[PDB]
Amino acid sequence: MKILVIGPSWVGDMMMSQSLYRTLQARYPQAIIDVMAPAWCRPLLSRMPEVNEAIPMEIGERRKLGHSLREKRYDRAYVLPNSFKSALVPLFAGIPHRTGWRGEMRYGLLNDVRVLDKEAWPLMVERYIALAYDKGIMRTAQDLPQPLLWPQLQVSEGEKSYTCNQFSLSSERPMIGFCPGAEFGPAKRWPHYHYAELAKQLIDEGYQVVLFGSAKDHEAGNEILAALNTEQQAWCRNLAGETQLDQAVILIAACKAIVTNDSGLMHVAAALNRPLVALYGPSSPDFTPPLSHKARVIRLITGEGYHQSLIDITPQRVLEELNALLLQEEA
């Protein structure tokens, strides 16, 4: 059962796609899954045991790429992105069965198009999982065989140990991880100064802080550090842009808890089953909530700058929620 998957180009979405891979291996015997995604995605995929290989990635190129995949003789293909062009490769590869939601009217590239009823499939994870089943079977998420297979990542003590040294982190104090960035824009970010105040409070409690993010979040990490004194800065490390996704996964796993905005790394922490506090403002967790029993969501409202709803969430409120989850973990 050779399967080719066109994976999404966002950390969050990629993490969610693991549910499809887990479901495919539970519903099909000897399912070999290859995933095609940007280069920077390879690290995350390498942490998923369900993935066999990460196919390394314009019209003229897409055809050549697709032609080279003919040798693989893929039995099936699943296109996760919604873009029209994303379903081109599978066709050029000559794959007989190509599945995916309609998206941008992919009636040609997909001979097994699924018409999406947003009300019938409220969660993104349910939408990915549904693709592993035959078309005329699932009408709503309630029809999905339970329990659903949520994203899940494992990390060994040896990995955590080495990686912490690889990034010059001290073992003399437990770590709390912060993910101050947000792919959907500044409006969804808890203020840099609130993260700084929270760090001061945590360092005072005996913890050390680590900031995770992409190269783009590096400046944000520095603005947070610039708000701490010398003594505190010694216990706050900015790793935004310094790690590959595989290293980020390992380090997040090594943290006692994580504080993050509605972003892709939130999903990574959730998959690792790490205690986490997710801060929401203009957006809601209705579509892509953190899938973990150890996660807590804080949002004060319903429904290029910061949003009042996030500015109104005080570091003290977050600290209280955090210390509670940290206690549970110790007990």
Tab-separated table of C-alpha atoms in Angstrom:
chain	number	residue	atom	x	y	z
A	1	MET	CA	0.000	0.000	0.000
A	2	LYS	CA	2.184	2.847	-1.325
A	3	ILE	CA	0.699	6.204	-0.416
A	4	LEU	CA	1.852	9.671	-1.444
A	5	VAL	CA	0.722	12.605	0.674
A	6	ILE	CA	0.985	16.241	-0.356
A	7	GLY	CA	1.451	17.821	3.051
A	8	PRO	CA	0.559	21.371	4.141
A	9	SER	CA	3.099	24.183	4.444
A	10	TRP	CA	2.279	25.230	7.998
A	11	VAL	CA	3.577	23.738	11.227
A	12	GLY	CA	0.142	23.523	12.823
A	13	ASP	CA	-1.500	21.901	9.811
A	14	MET	CA	1.406	19.481	9.377
A	15	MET	CA	1.082	18.405	12.992
A	16	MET	CA	-2.654	17.817	12.429
A	17	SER	CA	-1.943	15.774	9.306
A	18	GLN	CA	-0.308	13.164	11.505
A	19	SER	CA	-3.835	12.086	12.460
A	20	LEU	CA	-4.469	11.071	8.862
A	21	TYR	CA	-1.217	9.052	8.785
A	22	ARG	CA	-2.084	7.356	12.085
A	23	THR	CA	-5.575	6.612	10.796
A	24	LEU	CA	-4.288	5.250	7.472
A	25	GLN	CA	-2.059	2.739	9.225
A	26	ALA	CA	-4.941	1.666	11.441
A	27	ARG	CA	-7.364	1.162	8.524
A	28	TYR	CA	-4.979	-0.272	5.916
A	29	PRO	CA	-2.484	-3.156	6.126
A	30	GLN	CA	1.168	-2.316	5.451
A	31	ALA	CA	0.533	1.338	4.623
A	32	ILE	CA	3.778	2.959	3.442
A	33	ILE	CA	3.391	6.739	3.590
A	34	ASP	CA	5.612	9.253	1.802
A	35	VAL	CA	5.027	12.957	2.409
A	36	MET	CA	5.988	15.776	0.073
A	37	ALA	CA	6.465	19.134	1.789
A	38	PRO	CA	8.877	22.101	1.825
A	39	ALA	CA	12.468	21.453	2.924
A	40	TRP	CA	11.935	23.026	6.351
A	41	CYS	CA	9.161	20.487	6.981
A	42	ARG	CA	11.448	17.471	6.746
A	43	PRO	CA	12.641	17.863	10.370
A	44	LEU	CA	9.120	17.564	11.801
A	45	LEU	CA	8.244	14.620	9.577
A	46	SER	CA	11.362	12.833	10.800
A	47	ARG	CA	9.773	12.857	14.258
A	48	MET	CA	6.649	11.028	12.989
A	49	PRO	CA	7.034	7.215	12.938
A	50	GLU	CA	4.079	6.857	10.561
A	51	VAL	CA	6.061	8.572	7.793
A	52	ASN	CA	8.250	6.384	5.599
A	53	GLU	CA	10.061	9.076	3.633
A	54	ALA	CA	10.010	12.833	3.094
A	55	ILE	CA	9.975	13.423	-0.676
A	56	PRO	CA	12.320	16.406	-1.289
A	57	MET	CA	10.770	19.144	-3.425
A	58	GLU	CA	7.305	25.982	-12.111
A	59	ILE	CA	4.773	24.146	-14.279
A	60	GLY	CA	7.632	22.582	-16.210
A	61	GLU	CA	9.243	21.506	-12.946
A	62	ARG	CA	6.075	20.056	-11.430
A	63	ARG	CA	5.748	17.767	-14.448
A	64	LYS	CA	9.360	16.596	-14.178
A	65	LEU	CA	8.946	16.066	-10.439
A	66	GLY	CA	5.730	14.145	-11.000
A	67	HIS	CA	7.286	12.019	-13.739
A	68	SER	CA	10.160	10.951	-11.492
A	69	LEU	CA	7.614	9.660	-8.964
A	70	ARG	CA	6.159	7.207	-11.471
A	71	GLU	CA	8.848	4.701	-10.501
A	72	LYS	CA	7.498	4.755	-6.931
A	73	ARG	CA	4.260	3.314	-8.299
A	74	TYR	CA	2.105	5.003	-5.655
A	75	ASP	CA	-1.232	3.256	-5.199
A	76	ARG	CA	-2.980	6.275	-3.668
A	77	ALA	CA	-2.453	9.991	-3.157
A	78	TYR	CA	-3.881	12.491	-0.666
A	79	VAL	CA	-3.696	16.237	-1.268
A	80	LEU	CA	-4.004	18.223	1.976
A	81	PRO	CA	-3.417	21.807	0.862
A	82	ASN	CA	-6.413	23.521	-0.766
A	83	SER	CA	-4.517	25.210	-3.607
A	84	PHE	CA	-5.260	24.072	-7.142
A	85	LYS	CA	-1.601	23.611	-8.098
A	86	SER	CA	-0.960	21.409	-5.047
A	87	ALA	CA	-2.900	18.554	-6.665
A	88	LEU	CA	-0.935	18.679	-9.930
A	89	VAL	CA	1.989	16.435	-8.956
A	90	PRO	CA	-0.177	13.389	-8.103
A	91	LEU	CA	-1.741	13.521	-11.563
A	92	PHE	CA	1.597	13.777	-13.377
A	93	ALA	CA	2.794	10.852	-11.251
A	94	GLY	CA	0.081	8.727	-12.837
A	95	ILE	CA	-1.456	7.785	-9.488
A	96	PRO	CA	-4.853	6.057	-10.019
A	97	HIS	CA	-6.538	7.210	-6.805
A	98	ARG	CA	-6.184	10.858	-5.827
A	99	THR	CA	-8.185	12.048	-2.793
A	100	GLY	CA	-8.755	15.437	-1.180
A	101	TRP	CA	-11.332	18.071	-0.289
A	102	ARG	CA	-12.575	20.105	-3.248
A	103	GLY	CA	-10.627	23.207	-2.222
A	104	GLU	CA	-10.046	25.394	-5.289
A	105	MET	CA	-12.319	23.342	-7.556
A	106	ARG	CA	-9.912	20.426	-7.998
A	107	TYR	CA	-12.436	18.372	-9.979
A	108	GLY	CA	-9.732	17.317	-12.411
A	109	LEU	CA	-6.632	16.694	-10.337
A	110	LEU	CA	-8.756	14.757	-7.841
A	111	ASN	CA	-10.868	11.827	-9.040
A	112	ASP	CA	-12.077	11.357	-5.468
A	113	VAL	CA	-13.159	14.885	-4.562
A	114	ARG	CA	-14.882	15.375	-1.211
A	115	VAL	CA	-17.389	18.228	-0.848
A	116	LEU	CA	-16.821	19.975	2.469
A	117	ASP	CA	-19.693	20.828	4.813
A	118	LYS	CA	-18.038	23.103	7.392
A	119	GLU	CA	-20.837	22.507	9.893
A	120	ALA	CA	-20.535	18.735	9.534
A	121	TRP	CA	-16.757	18.827	10.154
A	122	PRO	CA	-16.001	21.613	12.702
A	123	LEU	CA	-12.446	20.488	13.508
A	124	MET	CA	-9.519	20.453	11.098
A	125	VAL	CA	-8.348	17.152	12.611
A	126	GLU	CA	-11.683	15.565	11.736
A	127	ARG	CA	-11.380	16.832	8.159
A	128	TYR	CA	-7.971	15.204	7.697
A	129	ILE	CA	-9.009	11.945	9.328
A	130	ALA	CA	-12.169	11.709	7.192
A	131	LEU	CA	-10.049	11.403	4.032
A	132	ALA	CA	-8.830	7.958	5.094
A	133	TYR	CA	-12.382	6.653	4.694
A	134	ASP	CA	-14.453	5.932	1.590
A	135	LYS	CA	-16.403	8.875	0.164
A	136	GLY	CA	-20.014	7.770	0.595
A	137	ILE	CA	-19.577	6.684	4.211
A	138	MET	CA	-18.911	9.708	6.429
A	139	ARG	CA	-21.472	12.540	6.381
A	140	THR	CA	-20.506	14.140	9.696
A	141	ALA	CA	-17.642	13.863	12.182
A	142	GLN	CA	-19.896	11.764	14.411
A	143	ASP	CA	-19.588	8.903	11.913
A	144	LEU	CA	-15.826	8.715	12.406
A	145	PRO	CA	-14.739	5.525	14.189
A	146	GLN	CA	-13.778	6.386	17.771
A	147	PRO	CA	-11.430	7.015	19.398
A	148	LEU	CA	-9.837	9.414	16.913
A	149	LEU	CA	-6.074	9.132	16.583
A	150	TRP	CA	-4.725	12.524	17.671
A	151	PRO	CA	-1.271	13.809	16.721
A	152	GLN	CA	1.291	12.315	19.071
A	153	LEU	CA	5.062	12.677	19.401
A	154	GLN	CA	7.560	10.854	21.622
A	155	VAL	CA	11.027	11.991	22.749
A	156	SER	CA	13.606	10.018	24.771
A	157	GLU	CA	15.587	11.263	27.768
A	158	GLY	CA	18.800	10.819	25.817
A	159	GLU	CA	17.560	13.108	23.056
A	160	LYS	CA	16.464	15.763	25.542
A	161	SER	CA	19.785	15.523	27.380
A	162	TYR	CA	22.039	15.998	24.350
A	163	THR	CA	19.888	18.647	22.688
A	164	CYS	CA	19.832	20.738	25.865
A	165	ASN	CA	23.650	20.722	25.824
A	166	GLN	CA	23.666	21.387	22.061
A	167	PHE	CA	21.914	24.658	22.824
A	168	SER	CA	23.984	25.541	25.887
A	169	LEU	CA	21.119	25.085	28.316
A	170	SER	CA	21.795	24.502	32.006
A	171	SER	CA	20.291	21.545	33.869
A	172	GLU	CA	20.566	23.460	37.147
A	173	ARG	CA	16.970	24.685	36.780
A	174	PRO	CA	13.692	23.413	35.234
A	175	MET	CA	12.607	25.057	31.993
A	176	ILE	CA	9.458	26.827	30.905
A	177	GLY	CA	9.110	27.386	27.181
A	178	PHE	CA	7.530	30.455	25.532
A	179	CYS	CA	6.310	30.640	21.910
A	180	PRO	CA	5.699	34.426	21.490
A	181	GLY	CA	5.226	34.394	17.721
A	182	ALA	CA	2.147	33.670	15.622
A	183	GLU	CA	1.837	32.841	11.948
A	184	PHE	CA	-1.549	34.556	11.685
A	185	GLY	CA	-0.131	37.961	12.588
A	186	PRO	CA	0.546	40.399	15.485
A	187	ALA	CA	-3.130	40.531	16.450
A	188	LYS	CA	-2.903	37.005	17.824
A	189	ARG	CA	0.249	37.604	19.849
A	190	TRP	CA	0.306	38.112	23.593
A	191	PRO	CA	2.366	41.331	24.089
A	192	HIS	CA	6.150	41.050	24.220
A	193	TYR	CA	6.133	42.953	27.521
A	194	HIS	CA	3.630	40.556	29.061
A	195	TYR	CA	5.915	37.634	28.168
A	196	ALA	CA	8.791	39.566	29.772
A	197	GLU	CA	6.877	40.174	33.006
A	198	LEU	CA	5.899	36.491	33.107
A	199	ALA	CA	9.534	35.496	32.619
A	200	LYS	CA	10.623	37.684	35.553
A	201	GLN	CA	8.010	36.015	37.739
A	202	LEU	CA	9.035	32.507	36.644
A	203	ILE	CA	12.760	33.120	37.047
A	204	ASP	CA	11.967	34.392	40.519
A	205	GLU	CA	10.182	31.081	41.218
A	206	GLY	CA	13.305	29.104	40.341
A	207	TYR	CA	12.632	28.377	36.659
A	208	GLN	CA	14.577	29.319	33.528
A	209	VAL	CA	12.866	30.442	30.317
A	210	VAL	CA	13.436	29.433	26.705
A	211	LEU	CA	11.896	31.260	23.737
A	212	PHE	CA	11.002	29.198	20.656
A	213	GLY	CA	10.129	30.465	17.194
A	214	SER	CA	11.238	30.961	13.596
A	215	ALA	CA	13.947	33.289	12.292
A	216	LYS	CA	11.207	35.905	12.003
A	217	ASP	CA	10.438	35.646	15.734
A	218	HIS	CA	14.061	36.303	16.714
A	219	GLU	CA	13.626	40.067	17.067
A	220	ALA	CA	10.536	39.411	19.184
A	221	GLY	CA	12.650	37.189	21.412
A	222	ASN	CA	15.274	39.908	21.758
A	223	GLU	CA	12.681	42.555	22.659
A	224	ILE	CA	11.517	40.242	25.458
A	225	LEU	CA	15.077	39.732	26.750
A	226	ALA	CA	15.781	43.465	26.616
A	227	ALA	CA	13.102	43.929	29.280
A	228	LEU	CA	14.929	41.788	31.832
A	229	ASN	CA	17.906	42.768	33.982
A	230	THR	CA	21.323	41.075	33.785
A	231	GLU	CA	20.576	38.500	36.475
A	232	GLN	CA	17.298	37.506	34.796
A	233	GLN	CA	18.753	37.452	31.278
A	234	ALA	CA	21.107	34.719	32.486
A	235	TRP	CA	18.019	32.533	32.853
A	236	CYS	CA	16.272	33.403	29.586
A	237	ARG	CA	17.472	32.011	26.248
A	238	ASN	CA	16.254	33.161	22.840
A	239	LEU	CA	16.265	30.141	20.514
A	240	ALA	CA	13.905	31.650	17.920
A	241	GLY	CA	15.520	30.961	14.541
A	242	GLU	CA	18.290	28.865	16.126
A	243	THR	CA	16.644	25.439	15.936
A	244	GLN	CA	15.354	23.095	13.237
A	245	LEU	CA	11.857	21.669	13.902
A	246	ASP	CA	13.254	18.353	15.121
A	247	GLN	CA	15.384	20.137	17.713
A	248	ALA	CA	12.428	22.343	18.663
A	249	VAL	CA	10.280	19.244	19.251
A	250	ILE	CA	12.929	17.766	21.547
A	251	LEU	CA	13.446	20.981	23.554
A	252	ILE	CA	9.720	21.585	23.956
A	253	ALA	CA	9.429	18.021	25.285
A	254	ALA	CA	12.130	18.887	27.857
A	255	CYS	CA	10.112	21.836	29.224
A	256	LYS	CA	7.988	21.541	32.369
A	257	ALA	CA	5.312	23.667	30.682
A	258	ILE	CA	4.719	25.833	27.623
A	259	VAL	CA	3.030	29.226	27.213
A	260	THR	CA	2.001	30.115	23.669
A	261	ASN	CA	-0.349	32.055	21.413
A	262	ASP	CA	-2.627	30.391	18.845
A	263	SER	CA	0.190	29.177	16.584
A	264	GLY	CA	1.785	26.135	14.969
A	265	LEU	CA	4.104	25.346	17.879
A	266	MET	CA	1.079	25.148	20.178
A	267	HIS	CA	0.070	22.008	18.284
A	268	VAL	CA	3.570	20.601	18.659
A	269	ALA	CA	3.478	21.043	22.460
A	270	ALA	CA	-0.010	19.470	22.528
A	271	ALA	CA	1.231	16.433	20.581
A	272	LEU	CA	4.037	16.036	23.119
A	273	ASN	CA	1.462	16.080	25.933
A	274	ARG	CA	3.309	18.868	27.756
A	275	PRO	CA	1.352	21.081	30.173
A	276	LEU	CA	0.471	24.162	28.167
A	277	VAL	CA	-1.363	27.455	28.490
A	278	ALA	CA	-2.706	28.784	25.180
A	279	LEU	CA	-3.558	32.489	24.973
A	280	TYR	CA	-6.342	33.586	22.627
A	281	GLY	CA	-7.544	37.013	21.603
A	282	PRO	CA	-9.336	37.812	18.314
A	283	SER	CA	-9.261	34.146	17.213
A	284	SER	CA	-10.945	31.154	18.862
A	285	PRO	CA	-9.905	27.501	19.328
A	286	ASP	CA	-13.088	26.335	17.552
A	287	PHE	CA	-11.282	25.025	14.444
A	288	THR	CA	-7.782	24.062	15.553
A	289	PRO	CA	-7.858	23.654	19.339
A	290	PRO	CA	-4.842	22.259	21.199
A	291	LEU	CA	-5.492	18.503	21.257
A	292	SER	CA	-4.227	17.523	24.703
A	293	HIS	CA	-5.788	16.892	28.095
A	294	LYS	CA	-2.972	18.893	29.712
A	295	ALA	CA	-3.722	22.087	27.786
A	296	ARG	CA	-5.702	25.052	29.111
A	297	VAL	CA	-7.041	27.899	26.997
A	298	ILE	CA	-7.392	31.468	28.193
A	299	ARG	CA	-9.606	33.880	26.254
A	300	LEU	CA	-11.482	36.883	27.620
A	301	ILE	CA	-13.767	37.564	24.653
A	302	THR	CA	-16.187	35.605	22.461
A	303	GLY	CA	-16.624	35.236	18.711
A	304	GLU	CA	-0.333	45.246	12.510
A	305	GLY	CA	-0.736	45.843	16.222
A	306	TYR	CA	-1.734	43.914	19.322
A	307	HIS	CA	-5.384	43.254	20.133
A	308	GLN	CA	-6.970	44.593	23.318
A	309	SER	CA	-8.294	41.131	24.190
A	310	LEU	CA	-4.721	39.842	24.551
A	311	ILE	CA	-3.369	42.995	26.171
A	312	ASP	CA	-6.089	42.492	28.813
A	313	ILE	CA	-4.760	39.047	29.753
A	314	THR	CA	-2.416	39.807	32.660
A	315	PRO	CA	0.843	37.942	33.372
A	316	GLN	CA	-0.583	37.207	36.832
A	317	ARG	CA	-3.617	35.409	35.386
A	318	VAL	CA	-1.337	33.298	33.174
A	319	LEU	CA	1.139	32.661	35.992
A	320	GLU	CA	-1.651	31.328	38.215
A	321	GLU	CA	-2.871	28.941	35.525
A	322	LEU	CA	0.712	27.860	34.854
A	323	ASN	CA	1.688	27.152	38.476
A	324	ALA	CA	-1.437	24.984	38.793
A	325	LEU	CA	-0.509	22.752	35.858
A	326	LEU	CA	3.098	22.656	37.046
A	327	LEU	CA	1.894	21.391	40.435
A	328	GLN	CA	-0.245	18.651	38.850
A	329	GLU	CA	2.788	17.438	36.925
A	330	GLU	CA	4.907	17.203	40.087
A	331	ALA	CA	2.205	15.398	42.063
